[PDB]
């Protein structure tokens, strides 16, 4: 399945019951690619983490952000409304409903 990728000669090799067969300097080629991939390494998987790590910090100094507002505005309503005829009405009436 792996060899599925790569801009490599799908000729130069050959598989069998216990191992793959390869022409020259191939495995050599492999490694090289590999070599580059370590210079990179982990390093990429770290980052995201790091990134992500702080991304949750914002939601915390941050998560709360809106739940407050919701609470914030929500109260204010009431303070205004509770004195409104129409709203008292709805209130006494709100129960007879179903």
């Amino acid at each position: 399945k792996l060899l599925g990728g790569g801009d490599v000669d799908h000729t130069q090799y050959a598989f069998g019951h216990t191992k793959v067969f390869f022409k020259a300097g191939l495995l050599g080629l492999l490694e090289e690619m590999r070599d580059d991939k370590l210079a990179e390494i982990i390093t990429a998987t770290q980052a995201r983490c790091r990134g992500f790590l702080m991304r949750v910090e914002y939601r915390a100094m941050v998560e709360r952000r809106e739940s407050i507002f919701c609470i914030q505005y929500n109260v204010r309503s009431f303070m205004n409304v509770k004195h409104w005829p129409w709203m008292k009405l709805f209130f006494k009436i709100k129960p007879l409903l179903k």
Partner: protein
């Protein structure tokens, strides 16, 4: 490009605590992540030093340097492939089910490579790991890529 996204400038006004429209160089790593970019901390460190910029001494910023540094980090978002994130953790635990034992992921995320504090590690496992001590990383990496 603008697509001129002027909301990056409005988010710089939410991270500058002095209101003078400058953001210190130590905040630029976390604000690139809050604008939708995940550069690794060594990469943020290199680039800085690369440009003979010292994050060791006092720093200020201007929007005119932070904008092109976010645009230089934005090309590196092609490194964020979720196949390799789930396959990394699938090679980290035996059997055909995606579960890391609690303390394996916590000690690896704090001590391997770019050190994440154990406070941040507990805030990233909180809710996805139940009392069985087994973190399902199929849903764990799904929720980590939801932010």
């Amino acid at each position: 490009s603008k697509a001129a996204a002027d909301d990056f400038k409005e988010a710089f006004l939410l991270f500058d605590r002095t209101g003078d429209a400058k953001i210190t160089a130590s905040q630029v790593g976390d604000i690139a992540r809050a604008l939708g970019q995940n550069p690794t901390n060594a990469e943020i460190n290199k680039i800085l030093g690369n440009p003979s910029k010292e994050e060791m001494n006092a720093a200020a910023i201007t929007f005119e340097e932070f904008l092109p540094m976010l645009q230089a980090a934005a090309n590196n978002k092609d490194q964020g492939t979720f196949e390799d994130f789930v396959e990394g953790l699938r090679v980290f635990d035996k059997e055909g089910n995606g579960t890391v034992m609690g303390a394996e992921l916590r000690h690896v995320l704090a001590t391997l490579g770019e050190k994440m504090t154990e406070e941040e590690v507990e805030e990233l496992m909180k809710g996805q790991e139940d009392s069985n001590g087994c973190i399902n990383y199929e849903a764990f990496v799904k929720h980590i890529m939801s932010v």
